[model samples]
Target: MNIFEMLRIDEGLRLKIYKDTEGYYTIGIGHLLTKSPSLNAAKSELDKAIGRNTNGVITKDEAEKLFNQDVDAAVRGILRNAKLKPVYDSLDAVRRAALINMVFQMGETGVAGFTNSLRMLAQKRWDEAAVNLAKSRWYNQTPNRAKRVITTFRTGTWDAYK
Candidate 1:
């Protein structure tokens, strides 16, 4: 696997600051993190790693680097949970990316609920696979993201809201 698909998946799109699981601060592809150094107390344990980065809040360059690194780790962790047997190795990157994006938006518990969609995917029925995702509460969460994924999966193109 190529360790990165930065632009294909980002502009970096929707790179907004948002509240995370513990209602903590993070941005840029779900990098659970800080915009201010004072939050060190609440930051994810980067004690040793932070030391490597000079320990202050950090510039845009640092945040960008961390965003890339953090997303890689997150995606890999999600894959371990996916474990889709025969399909894992053969799935296309765009298809796999949509799956990973779903996991990113919804954690393991939420994604595990995409039972029908996953089944359609495993069945090699792309169009059917795409719609099943629409029938989800996740579809209720954000029409565009889901639409983009469904469209890409169904039509075999990556045109997520331009």
Candidate 2:
């Protein structure tokens, strides 16, 4: 299966997977994925892209190397907050990963901003989880993007749109 398939990018979703300036392959935004000439070159390109995308705050190298750390920070931020931990802890690994990804993209305050969804997840209501996922500001702002990740969480399989 393709990376997008594994990540569950579905119909109506917009994702970009492309080779960066230094020629490393990446899967994100709205670009096509391609083979990188070399790992080091790819890392350089990734660093540039990440730096540009993050407003020079985070280099591509930092994003590429510390991706997990970024997600961990987001998760910890959620766990630190009283309102989000119950639901966050109740989720399975895949769902938890997806949630952390979304929260990373949206920020802790932004993710916790999903009051209804958080409540539903804490209750382990699948349908409600889907509904709440769809009702998020992230969903509204990036409907296709949000749907892709939400589908991953809902199905526990990254096969929506490979």
Candidate 3:
């Protein structure tokens, strides 16, 4: 798990600005804020993108804990959150994993914001849902990834997502 140093980019000795896809202002490896159940962990701040100057570097173990806590909330949002559970449970494992991937990148609520996409996906309307997914800012920001998810959900198979 600590090998996340390789799993994700670890710009050793940072002195610049960056935010994860979910925009949480990641710190010390991949540690993310776990408290907020909805929305980006933090929106805008001077040091946010550059990294938290207020706090120093955290250990790999600490980062793992934070990652776990936040991931727990996201998973719970998938299995327990009333609005997501039914739809979340209806998909095939490949599709389910695809949705989970989306939740991780966009947050449960964030992915849920695609009401039409979810509704269309739930109805087994693959192309329609894929189209719905394409009609989003996410597609504009990261077309490859958005398309991978759309294609995966539509075909019930996993893509390399490179």
Clashes of each: 0, 12, 0
Candidate 2 local Cα displacement, residue 12, angstroms: 18
Model 3: per-residue lDDT, tens digit, 1-162?
Answer: 121222233223222223555554545434443334333433233235334443334445555555565456667888876767788888877787677667766778788788888888889999888887998899898786677677878888654343
> Which runs in model 3 stand beyond 4 Å of their true positions?
1-18, 21-24, 28-55
lDDT of 1 by residue, 80-111 (tens): 76544334445777766666665555655577
What TM-score, over all chains together, does every model reach?
Answer: 0.66, 0.59, 0.66
TM-score winner between 1 and 2, please give it: 1
For model 3, where is the 10-residue window of minimal lDDT? 1-10
Each prediction's Cα lDDT score?
0.58, 0.58, 0.61
Clashing pairs in 3: none
Give all candidate RMSDs, comma-separated. 4.9, 9.2, 6.8
Give lDDT tens digits, candidate 2, residues 25-125.
55443222236566455445545645544321343344344444544567688789787787778877767766766665656787788887777777767
lDDT for 17 (candidate 1): 46
lDDT of candidate 2 vs native? 0.58
